[PDB]
Amino acid sequence: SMENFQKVEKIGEGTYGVVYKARNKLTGEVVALKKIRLDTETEGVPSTAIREISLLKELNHPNIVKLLDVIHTENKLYLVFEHVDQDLKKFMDASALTGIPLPLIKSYLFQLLQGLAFCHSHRVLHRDLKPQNLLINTEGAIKLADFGLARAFGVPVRTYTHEVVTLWYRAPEILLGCKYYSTAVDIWSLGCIFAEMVTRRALFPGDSEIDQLFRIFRTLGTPDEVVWPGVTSMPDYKPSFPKWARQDFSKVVPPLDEDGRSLLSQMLHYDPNKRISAKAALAHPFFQDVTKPVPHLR
Amino acid sequence: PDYHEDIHTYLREMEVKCKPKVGYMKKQPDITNSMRAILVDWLVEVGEEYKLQNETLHLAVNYIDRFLSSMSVLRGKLQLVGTAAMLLASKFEEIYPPEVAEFVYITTYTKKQVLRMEHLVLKVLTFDLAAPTVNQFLTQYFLHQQPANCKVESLAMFLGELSLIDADPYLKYLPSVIAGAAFHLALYTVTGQSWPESLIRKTGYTLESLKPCLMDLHQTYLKAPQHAQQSIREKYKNSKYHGVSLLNPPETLNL
Numbered sequence: 001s002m003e004n005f006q007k008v009e010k011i012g013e014g015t016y017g018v019v020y021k022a023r024n025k026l027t028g029e030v031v032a033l034k035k036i037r038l039d040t041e042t043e044g045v046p047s048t049a050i051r052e053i054s055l056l057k058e059l060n061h062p063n064i065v066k067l068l069d070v071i072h073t074e075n076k077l078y079l080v081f082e083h084v085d086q087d088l089k090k091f092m093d094a095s096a097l098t099g100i101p102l103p104l105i106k107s108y109l110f111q112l113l114q115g116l117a118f119c120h121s122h123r124v125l126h127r128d129l130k131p132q133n134l135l136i137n138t139e140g141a142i143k144l145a146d147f148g149l150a151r152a153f154g155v156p157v158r159t160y161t162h163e164v165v166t167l168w169y170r171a172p173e174i175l176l177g178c179k180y181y182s183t184a185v186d187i188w189s190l191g192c193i194f195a196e197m198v199t200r201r202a203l204f205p206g207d208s209e210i211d212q213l214f215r216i217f218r219t220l221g222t223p224d225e226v227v228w229p230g231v232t233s234m235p236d237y238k239p240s241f242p243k244w245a246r247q248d249f250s251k252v253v254p255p256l257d258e259d260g261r262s263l264l265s266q267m268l269h270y271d272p273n274k275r276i277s278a279k280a281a282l283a284h285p286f287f288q289d290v291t292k293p294v295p296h297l298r
Numbered sequence: 299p300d301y302h303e304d305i306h307t308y309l310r311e312m313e314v315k316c317k318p319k320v321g322y323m324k325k326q327p328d329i330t331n332s333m334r335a336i337l338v339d340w341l342v343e344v345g346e347e348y349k350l351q352n353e354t355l356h357l358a359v360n361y362i363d364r365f366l367s368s369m370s371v372l373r374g375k376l377q378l379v380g381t382a383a384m385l386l387a388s389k390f391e392e393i394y395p396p397e398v399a400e401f402v403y404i405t406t407y408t409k410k411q412v413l414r415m416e417h418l419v420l421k422v423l424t425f426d427l428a429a430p431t432v433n434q435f436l437t438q439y440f441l442h443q444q445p446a447n448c449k450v451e452s453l454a455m456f457l458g459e460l461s462l463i464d465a466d467p468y469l470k471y472l473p474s475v476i477a478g479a480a481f482h483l484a485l486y487t488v489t490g491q492s493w494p495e496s497l498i499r500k501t502g503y504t505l506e507s508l509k510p511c512l513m514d515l516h517q518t519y520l521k522a523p524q525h526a527q528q529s530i531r532e533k534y535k536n537s538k539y540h541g542v543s544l545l546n547p548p549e550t551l552n553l
């Protein structure tokens with residue numbers, strides 16, 4: 001089964017299992033192998049694998065990581081993916097002293113919004129967008145990866161798992177305990193990442209839920225009934241919350257110009273209903289002169 | 299609702315691919331529709347015992363029907379298929395699925411058997427478990443009520459769920475069509491209203507295209523207190539579903 005693959009090295013561990021770089025000996029194709037240990041006498045095939053596999057078989061898109069095969073023993077599960085070259089985080093670290101060219105930031109956000117609009121159109125929530133889960137290749141592509149936290153949703157949504165999204169990228173409606181969250185939670189994460197592509201540090205680096213909320217409030221202002229009808233009724237809202245004034249966005253990500261700031265502000269809207277969809281964002285004026293340059297490093 | 303139409307269109311495509319084989323039971327040497335009814339009813343019970351989503355039930359039934367579309371099963375192993383299917387549906391759909399131990403307990407078989415059957419069901423279905431259900435179409439149709447009515451909703455779910463029990467006739471109807479029939483029937487029973495114009499625009503279905511399903515569903519509804527399987531009726535007596543199974547079906551539809 002695994003006979004035609006030669007392991008090269010370990011890449012890392014995401015939500016579940018282990019990923020390795022390998023090569024198809026017969027075709028030359030370099031792949032990413034997600035290795036999942038099963039057993040019996042325990043829980044069987046993990047819900048994360050069930051979800052990821054079934055959803056990734058439907059989501060064929062240039063900006064979504066491609067699932068090639070499932071090799072399924074009684075003991076081990078192996079997801080075979082197309083190998084992508086680097087993750088966004090490592091690339092942002094490497095851009096330490098050059099910066100990332102604006103055309104490349106704009107290309108990446110455009111592509112990310114494409115992959116995300118395709119997911120949402122196919123009733124999939126990603127629920128873990130962060131630079132580590134975003135993969136870039138030598139031809140200028142970026143792709144959504146690690147669908148281990150993804151799920152299929154309904155219209156309208158019902159309550160889904162609360163403990164969702166890596167904290168820095170986690171939307172305020174999750175933080176404030178709302179029983180319905182939806183597609184807008186992925187847009188929030190992408191807004192956080194847009195900002196991060198520009199400054200090259202996380203926009204809201206909290207170490208706890210309250211810390212995270214307060215970092216959000218200090219930047220965008222503390223939400224009230226005017227900006228976000230319903231906020232004060234939310235389960236983990238507190239009247240004791242400090243009431244910070246909203247920062248001018250030109251100060252939130254200083255290198256961004258008018259169009260970029262507008263787009264960012266619609267991605268970071270408190271009210272999930274008012275937050276821009278990935279679909280509507282593709283036609284933002286920010287993107288009028290978008291191109292797809294190869295990355296400028298490697 | 300930036301995606302309501304995209305999602306509906308996509309579900310309409312997927313339900314055709316996810317469809318079970320309509321005549322599979324004639325090809326089964328050792329099991330019948332009546333045996334399937336018994337199994338489905340028991341799953342309704344498991345659903346209630348564990349407070350599972352109605353969606354999980356609808357998915358588990360889709361997995362069983364697609365499994366039995368290609369795999370011959372002896373009557374003594376039919377409950378093992380149903381258990382693995384419900385385990386798979388729970389892992390996919392539930393925030394807190396029951397553990398394997400709980401499924402072993404609720405059945406007859408070993409943990410080893412259940413887990414091997416799980417792996418078998420995944421192989422046969424080729425891991426394609428994100429299937430459209432009557433439930434997924436109903437919740438979108440519910441958006442077209444003016445105003446929203448809890449009795450209409452619960453009764454539509456009740457009718458859509460009864461359709462799960464009887465392979466003949468319901469295997470021949472798509473989930474979107476069963477959902478159409480269930481929604482009109484409920485609306486009519488409760489308020490005297492009909493399949494709304496906005497749903498014709500959305501779905502392309504009229505009362506004419508829904509009619510054969512409706513005639514079947516209306517008969518199922520009238521004969522429901524007399525059916526050998528009764529778990530859905532009991533389940534829907536609960537205040538959680540507004541006691542809708544206590545409501546009287548209409549004598550005629552006048553379509």
Ligand SMILES: NS(=O)(=O)c1ccc(Nc2nc(OCC3CCCCC3)c3nc[nH]c3n2)cc1
Nearest residue numbers: 012013014019032081082084085086087090146
């Ligand atoms: N660190 S890094 O910059 O050196 C680098 C990173 C990732 C990859 N390649 C790659 N990785 C995957 O998952 C890796 C996995 C690791 C843990 C976090 C979730 C993602 C894939 N899944 C399909 N295709 C994949 N391709 C190459 C180099």
